[PDB]
Amino acid sequence: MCDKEFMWALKNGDLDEVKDYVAKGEDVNRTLEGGRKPLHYAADCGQLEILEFLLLKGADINAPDKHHITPLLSAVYEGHVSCVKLLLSKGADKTVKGPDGLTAFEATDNQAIKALL
Numbered sequence: 001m002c003d004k005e006f007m008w009a010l011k012n013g014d015l016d017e018v019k020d021y022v023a024k025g026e027d028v029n030r031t032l033e034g035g036r037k038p039l040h041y042a043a044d045c046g047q048l049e050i051l052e053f054l055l056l057k058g059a060d061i062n063a064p065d066k067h068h069i070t071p072l073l074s075a076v077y078e079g080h081v082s083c084v085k086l087l088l089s090k091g092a093d094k095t096v097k098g099p100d101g102l103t104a105f106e107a108t109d110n111q112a113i114k115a116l117l
Contacts, residue, residue: 003033010041015049028059035066043071043087046080051087061092068099076104076113084113 001024009017018038022028031037039059042050051071055061062070072092075083088094094104094117105117 006038007032007034007036007041010038010047010050011045013045013047013050015053018050018053022057028054028057029063031065036069037063037065037071039063039071040065040069040074043075043080043083044078046075046078046083048080048082048086051083055090061087061090062096064096068097070096072096073098073104073107076108079108079110079113081110081112081116084116088116 001021005017006021006026008014009021028038032041034041037059038054039051039061042054061072064070070092072084072087072094073096075087097103098107100107105114108114
């Protein structure tokens with residue numbers, strides 16, 4: 001068990017492997033070796049099922065990574081509409097500014113995400 005495989009599981013949708021790490025003692029809020037938290041890796045790659053599992057285990061929906069980026073901003077940057085919907089419906093702060101100074105509204109050009117914000 002190592003962080004490198006944990007980050008891969010969150011990125012690639014391996015929910016069972018993510019459940020393995022958590023059941024074996026992993027903290028769903030710990031910033032991994034890559035500089036991001038589990039929610040950041042799941043939201044960046046649009047893993048909707050992992051996002052749900054992480055929040056139910058107590059993951060901070062607004063926690064930043066090492067680059068002042070929230071899980072909501074990470075999902076917006078790659079246009080994961082369903083992930084934006086789930087994070088917003090769970091109370092994600094839409095007013096946080098990214099590392100470039102723009103909020104989730106100003107950072108995206110996809111108007112479908114802009115409507116939900």
